[PDB]
Amino acid sequence: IVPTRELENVFLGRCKDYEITRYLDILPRVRSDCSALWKDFFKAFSFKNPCDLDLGSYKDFFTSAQQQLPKNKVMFWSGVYDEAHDYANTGRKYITLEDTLPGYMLNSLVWCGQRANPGFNEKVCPDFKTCPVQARESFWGMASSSYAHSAEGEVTYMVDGSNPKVPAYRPDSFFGKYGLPNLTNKVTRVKVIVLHRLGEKIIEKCGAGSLLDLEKLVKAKHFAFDCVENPRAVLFLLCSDNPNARECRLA
């Protein structure tokens, strides 16, 4: 894959933008300045082969970068990037990882280490399905752990209930592996929202299949659990993009 151009300039430009202007009434500022944060991010992978990473690599960066998160507002998602972010509505209804400082700075970017100066590969990065599991998941897995550990009160999890190749919930997704196990006693409830894509076969249902496995897990942690398929608020967002869909007919 093609690495992000001007990585340091982009990281630093997003960081300063976020610091001064973004999520001011939703998330707290971090103590560390943008240059300290860059130093922690870069040392996680620089001057190393591109797959020489593990879950501990970005430890200092995520420590510096972590924010206290709004109680009852944390959301996770798997398989539903646009619908989850459209619904969270840039922190107004829920926070996603990608609205927090480390998530916002690195969202959509591509980078990797190399041993030779300048310590990072400006030409090519591995498909990363290519590196071993602990390396491929080093950055977003630590991102997910740290974010989960900071969640408080009700947490929401949006999943795709219409994908015949990928269960709504799986033990090895970033949420499965780094989210749920890292929810603490500050969390009171996991609220699942199952998306049923308009015009598509329903594959997964609350109370059955992988959602029942998730339910059992949630309860084993002593959180409450609820699950809803296409709640009206989410259904109308879907309809907005597909207003003639059968599901959208009004009275």
End-to-end CA distance of the chain: 49
Give whichever of 13 and 181 is closer to its own copies, judged by the CB atom: 13
Angle between helices 7-21 and 34-45 (to 10 degrees): 140
Residues 105-144 that bind its own copies (CB under 8 A): 108-109
Please identify, among the stretches 3-11, 62-70, 148-156, 209-217, the one whose residues bind its own copies according to the rule CB under 8 A.
3-11
Question: What secondary structure letter does DSSP report for 139?
Answer: H
Neighbours of 200 (CB within 10 A): 14
What are the residues binding ligand NAD (CB under 6 A)?
76-79, 81, 96-98, 107, 129, 140, 144, 173-175
- Does the footprint of its own copies cover residue 27 (CB under 8 A)? no
Q: φ and ψ at 194, to 5 degrees?
A: -95, 120
Which of the 8 DSSP states describes residue 237?
A: H
Q: Is 185 in the site for its own copies (CB under 8 A)?
A: no
Q: Are 97 and 30 in contact (CB under 8 A)?
A: no
185 binds, among ligand NAD, its own copies, none (CB under 5 to 8 A by kind): none
User: What is the binding site for its own copies (CB under 8 A)?
Assistant: 4-6, 9-10, 12-17, 20-21, 86-87, 89, 108-109, 232-234, 236-237, 239-241, 243-244, 248-251
